[PDB]
């Protein structure tokens, strides 16, 4: 047996173990644009309750038209990183528009928020510095942190007392600069980071405060600017990383927003910015149109908020165990991996598409169905979805 | 002085030292689509010889139209990672077409080749395994390896004798599985990895062979399939990572192409695939058209080969210091960063758009102008550019 073929046998063995443990992820092949309803290649039509399409801009007509228009004016690809020939006027406009929207001095575009986080920490922090992360921070944050030389600390999820403990320990350990960093909204439980308390605690220690706003930009806060607006610390955030691929259009792109000197050093040294393609013109142009829409009217985020209240109230009424909160991410606790797999499959048969999370992604006993509201859904369709939850929940003994 | 404000003082001091060293990159703001000629916002139209637009596909009318069409049929964004609700039939089609184009069993799309590399090594290798890298491997390869637990070895650039030394050492150290990984064509010097020799050497040690084809897919080899075709080892590569953002359209996206079980495990476990947005439908649809074009005729990669031979011969005639090779990446070595920026600035005045390359993009003391040829240019424009290079080079004491 050659080593190379043994390698492939070990890969196949691992895949079979995943299957046998019930952990294998199945891709359902969608035939339609993204929307409130979709249809797979086998003709099954479903209400879609597990997209990041919070404001319905993924297939909004003015967004699609801005994309067509930018293809005509600025082309399909730039085939270049930003410093060579990959910067259009579109990119500078979007960076300025995002800076104003988020309350920061400047913004640097990336291909994705995953790469914004990956390219963040290594440039800004070194071995004498500390990063203090919420224990449930997003994977892309951890990997950016692991690529840096920074000292690593974690505080218990949303635990301000433990955040103080970690800031105390980082100080005792002799940290030069300290960055407290957290998801603004955590996708697994929909909780909203306590940014007002974190800002005050950061100020006590002279620490920086950074947030990852992927599940917030566009609809958190009264004007939809983000978790920092909702928590009353708009303009008091050192670093915001975020995505264009969720509420703000759903195609691609991400960004880091900060003081102008941080953004400037990121352009000079951040490895995904130096060594990965610029954002495509059509995505940049559509994103400017997204900001035009969201700065003109709060109607879409107001509709998302009403849809979220309606669905949270209905699940509560039916008897489900729903994680507390008001976020469009609505986690329905079902404890067992098998119960979650059964509920997601039964809902699919009933015309409702959700996603389940279970061990080892979440702890034993913490299995859940993750529903995500959209401004797209109307309350009649949401009621039809609640009826499917009611049916499957009664069948499976959950309610 | 608070630690937080001291942090910004540290950042500003570093920015000033970059400027004082002559290593500060400035962005030019392009007002037009990508093409053989572009115009900046100030109105100056110039010949672009520094794009990854190797085959002219970034603004090819059939490629632009395929993007319009996918916008109409499949929408602007999917706002989901692949496994939840971000897989359309387009994605599966592109993955099948890339696999056939590249000679592999299956393909997994990423948002970028930077992400493909970042998510490769940690998924497939463990603490008992080894990765053996060419010393000049791309930053995205290095960061992917750093994120993994594999034991790291480096061999001297394009040195097969030293590659054997490292394979021997890795075996002596007790490696379980060994992956030799190299740029197929190196981004900064244009050299072509000796994949035929590396395949033979890998076979002797039972090692896997992986390549990053970003500056190769579409135009290397007689049918433009890649470096492996060019080196006679098509169908004998374990792992291909690559981009859609260079010759294959220039917008966004990347991929890993491999045996079906490797691709399957990457879908289950690769962090950039699990935790970053799916590729936008318009980019997927246009990439399918790109492969229709390139599989129907080799005329574009043939025109690129002729333009490259003509331009290298002209630069040689004029007396420039050019890295040896035949690749469309033509590195004009100036060593000193100041003179790199001086040459690029003077060429712009003379009607030619190139950009100085210097640290950290290339090593200190090894600054250069990376010229890149494209199928787009006609001989008359290349001759005009040669004349500009001659005049600028003589003005600047370079030739």
Residues 6+ apart with CB under 8 A from B221: B227, B228, B229, B230, B234
Given the DSSP bridges, would you call strands A367-372 and A355-357 parallel, antiparallel or unpaired? antiparallel
Based on the domain organization, do A315 and A335 belong to the same domain?
yes
* 3-state secondary structure (DSSP) of residue B90: helix
Tokens for A228? 């920092």
Based on the domain organization, do A243 and A280 belong to the same domain?
yes
Distance, CA of A68 to chain centre: 26
Q: How far apart are CA B223 and CA B233, in angstroms?
A: 14
Domain boundary among A278, A296, A314: A296
Domain presence at residue A384 = yes
Q: How far apart are CA A216 and CA A228, in angstroms?
A: 9
Burial class (CB in 10 A: 0-12, 13-18, 19+), A1: exposed
**Nearest one of B60, B58, B107 to B82, comparing CA atoms:** B107
Sheet of B130-134, strands arranged across: B106-110, B254-258, B239-243, B208-212, B178-183, B130-134, B151-155
Residues 6+ apart with CB under 8 A from B30: A85, A87, A88, A89, B38, B39, B40, B41
Tokens for B292? 């229709």
Over the range A198-233, which residues count as b (16 or more CB within 10 Å of their CB) and which as e?
A: bbebbeebbbbbbbbbbbbbbbbbeebbbbbbbbeb
Based on the domain organization, do B239 and B282 belong to the same domain?
yes
B336 CB neighbour count, 10 Å cutoff: 13
Select the residue from A18, A35, A84 to test the B interface by mutation, using most B Cβ atoms within 10 A.
A84
Domain presence at residue B210 = yes
* 3-state secondary structure (DSSP) of residue B306: helix
Based on the domain organization, do A101 and A130 belong to the same domain?
yes
**Nearest one of A278, A229, A234, A216 to A252, comparing CA atoms:** A278
Question: CB–CB of B29 and A92 under 8 A?
Answer: yes
Q: Are B392 and A124 in contact (CB under 8 A)?
A: no
Across the interface, of A77, A124, A208, the residue whose CB is closest to B251 is A77
Based on the domain organization, do B204 and B86 belong to the same domain?
yes
Range of the domain at A349: 23-52+299-395
Sheet of A355-357, strands arranged across: A321-322, A329-335, A367-372, A355-357
DSSP A131: E
Q: How far apart are CA A113 and CA A238, in angstroms?
A: 17
Is B157 part of the annotated catalytic residue set? no
Tokens for B237? 């590569």
Query: Is residue A276 part of an annotated ligand binding site?
Result: yes
Residues 6+ apart with CB under 8 A from A106: A95, A99, A257, A258, A259, A260, A263, A264
Q: At what angle do helices B61-74 and B281-296 cross, to 10 degrees?
A: 140
The number of C-beta contacts closer than 8 angstroms across A and B is 335
**Which of chain B's residues have a Cβ under 8 Å away from the Cβ of A374?**
none
**Number of residues that this document lists for chain B:** 399
Q: Are A143 and A119 in contact (CB under 8 A)?
A: no
B324 CB neighbour count, 10 Å cutoff: 9
Distance, CA of B206 to chain centre: 28
Report, as residue numbers or ranges, the catalytic residues of A.
187, 215, 246
Q: How far apart are CA B190 and CA A269, in angstroms?
A: 22
Check B60, B215, B228, B327 and give the catalytic one. Answer: B215
* 3-state secondary structure (DSSP) of residue A299: helix
Q: How far apart are CA B179 and CA B171, in angstroms?
A: 12
Domain presence at residue A12 = no
**Number of residues that this document lists for chain A:** 399
- Elucidation technique: X-ray
Q: How far apart are CA A299 and CA A375, in angstroms?
A: 9
Q: Are B146 and B175 in contact (CB under 8 A)?
A: no
Q: Radius of gyration over alpha carbons of chain A, in Å?
A: 22
Beta-bridge partners for A155: A134
Question: CB–CB of A35 and B87 under 8 A?
Answer: no
A326 CB neighbour count, 10 Å cutoff: 12
Domain presence at residue A228 = yes
Query: Is residue A298 part of an annotated ligand binding site?
Result: no
Question: CB–CB of A4 and B64 under 8 A?
Answer: no
Based on the domain organization, do B234 and B223 belong to the same domain?
yes
Q: Are B187 and B329 in contact (CB under 8 A)?
A: yes
Q: How far apart are CA A266 and CA A274, in angstroms?
A: 9
Q: How many CA atoms lie within 13 A of A228 on its CB side?
A: 27
Using the Cα atoms of residue A249, residue A358, residue B123 and residue B86 in order, give the sign of their dihedral: negative
* 3-state secondary structure (DSSP) of residue A180: strand
Helical H segments across B224-378, by residue range = 227-230, 260-269, 271-274, 281-296, 299-318, 337-349
Distance from A298 to chain B by nearest Cα, in Å?
20
Based on the domain organization, do A214 and A309 belong to the same domain?
no
> CATH no. for residue A194?
3.40.640.10
Based on the domain organization, do A247 and A118 belong to the same domain?
yes
Distance from A362 to chain B by nearest Cα, in Å?
15
Place of tokens 């350990």: A173
**Nearest one of A154, A276, A220, A29 to B139, comparing CA atoms:** A276
Domain presence at residue A4 = no
Tokens for A209? 């405060």
* 3-state secondary structure (DSSP) of residue B1: coil
Q: Are A367 and A358 in contact (CB under 8 A)?
A: yes
Domain presence at residue B221 = yes
**Which of chain B's residues have a Cβ under 8 Å away from the Cβ of A59?**
75-77
Q: Are B266 and B280 in contact (CB under 8 A)?
A: no
* 3-state secondary structure (DSSP) of residue A143: helix
Query: Is residue A52 part of an annotated ligand binding site?
Result: no
Q: Are A288 and A93 in contact (CB under 8 A)?
A: yes
Burial class (CB in 10 A: 0-12, 13-18, 19+), A379: middle
Based on the domain organization, do A264 and A188 belong to the same domain?
yes
Distance, CA of A16 to chain centre: 30
Through-space distance between the first and last CA atoms of chain B, rounded to whole angstroms: 52
Q: Are A143 and A116 in contact (CB under 8 A)?
A: no
Q: How far apart are CA A54 and CA A376, in angstroms?
A: 8
Domain presence at residue A27 = yes
Q: How far apart are CA B52 and CA B63, in angstroms?
A: 16
- φ/ψ of A68, rounded to 5, equals -55, -45
Place of tokens 């919420």: A134
Residues 6+ apart with CB under 8 A from B258: B104, B105, B106, B107, B238, B239, B240, B266
DSSP character string of B168-209: HHHHHTT-SSEEEEEESB-TTT-PBP-HHHHHHHHHHHT-EE
Over the range B256-268, which residues count as b (16 or more CB within 10 Å of their CB) and which as e?
A: bbbbbbbbbbbbb
Q: How far apart are CA B360 and CA B264, in angstroms?
A: 36
Q: How many CA atoms lie within 13 A of A70 on its CB side?
A: 29
Domain presence at residue B2 = no
Based on the domain organization, do A222 and A361 belong to the same domain?
no
Residues 6+ apart with CB under 8 A from B362: B188, B368
Chain A contact for B113 (CB, 8 A cutoff)? yes
Q: Are B133 and B152 in contact (CB under 8 A)?
A: yes
Domain boundary among B249, B264, B296: B296
DSSP character string of B15-53: HHHHHHTT-------B-S-SSSEEEBTT--EEEE---S-
Through-space distance between the first and last CA atoms of chain A, rounded to whole angstroms: 54
Based on the domain organization, do A250 and A380 belong to the same domain?
no
Domain boundary among A296, A311, A327: A296
Q: How far apart are CA B6 and CA A259, in angstroms?
A: 13
Q: Are B275 and A254 in contact (CB under 8 A)?
A: no
Based on the domain organization, do B274 and B350 belong to the same domain?
no
- φ/ψ of B319, rounded to 5, equals 105, 15
Measure Cα distances from A358 to A154, A186, A386, B292 in Å.
23, 16, 22, 42
What does this entry list as its resolution, in Å? 1.8
Q: What's the structural domain count of chain B?
A: 2
A349 CB neighbour count, 10 Å cutoff: 11
Over the range A104-128, which residues count as b (16 or more CB within 10 Å of their CB) and which as e?
A: bebbbbbbbbbbbbbbbbbbbbeee
Q: How far apart are CA A338 and CA A334, in angstroms?
A: 9
**Nearest one of B352, B346, B354 to B398, comparing CA atoms:** B346
Question: CB–CB of B79 and A208 under 8 A?
Answer: no
> CATH no. for residue B324?
3.90.1150.10
């Amino acid at each position: 047996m050659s080593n190379a073929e043994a390698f492939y046998a070990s890969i196949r063995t691992e895949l079979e173990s995943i299957r046998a443990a019930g952990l294998f992820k199945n891709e359902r092949v969608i035939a339609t644009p993204q929307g409130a309803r979709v249809r797979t290649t086998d003709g099954r039509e479903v209400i879609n309750l597990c997209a990041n399409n919070y404001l319905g801009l993924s297939s909004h007509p003015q967004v699609i038209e801005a994309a067509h228009e930018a293809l005509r004016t600025h082309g399909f690809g730039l085939s270049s990183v930003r410093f060579i020939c990959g910067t259009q006027d579109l990119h500078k406009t979007l960076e300025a528009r995002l800076s104003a929207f988020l309350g920061t001095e400047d913004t640097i575009l990336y291909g994705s928020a995953f790469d914004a986080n990956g390219g963040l920490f290594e440039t800004l922090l070194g071995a004498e510095d500390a990063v203090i992360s919420d224990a449930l921070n997003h994977a892309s944050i951890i990997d950016g942190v692991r690529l840096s030389k920074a000292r690593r600390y974690r505080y218990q999820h949303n635990d301000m007392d433990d955040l103080r403990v970690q800031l105390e320990q980082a100080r005792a350990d002799g940290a030069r600069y300290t960055l407290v960093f957290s998801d603004g909204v955590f996708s697994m439980d929909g909780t909203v980071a306590r940014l007002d308390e974190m800002r005050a605690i950061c100020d006590e220690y002279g620490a920086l405060l950074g947030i990852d706003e992927c599940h917030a930009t566009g609809f958190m806060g009264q004007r939809g600017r983000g978790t920092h607006e909702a928590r009353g610390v708009f303009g008091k955030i050192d670093i915001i990383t975020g995505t264009l691929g969720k509420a703000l259009g759903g195609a691609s792109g991400g960004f880091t927003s900060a003081r102008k000197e941080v953004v400037a050093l990121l352009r000079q040294r951040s490895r995904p910015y130096l060594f990965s393609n610029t954002v495509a013109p059509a995505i940049v142009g559509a994103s400017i149109a997204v900001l035009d829409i969201l700065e003109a009217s709060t109607e879409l985020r107001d509709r998302l908020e009403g849809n979220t209240r309606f669905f949270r109230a209905g699940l509560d009424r039916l008897g489900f165990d729903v994680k507390a909160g008001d976020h469009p991410i609505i986690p329905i606790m079902v404890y067992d991996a098998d119960k979650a797999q059964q509920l997601a499959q039964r809902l699919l048969e009933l015309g409702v598409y959700v996603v389940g999370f279970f061990y080892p992604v979440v702890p034993k006993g913490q299995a859940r169905i993750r529903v995500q509201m959209s401004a797209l859904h109307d309350e009649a369709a949401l009621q039809a979805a609640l009826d499917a939850f009611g049916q499957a929940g009664r069948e499976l003994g959950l309610i």
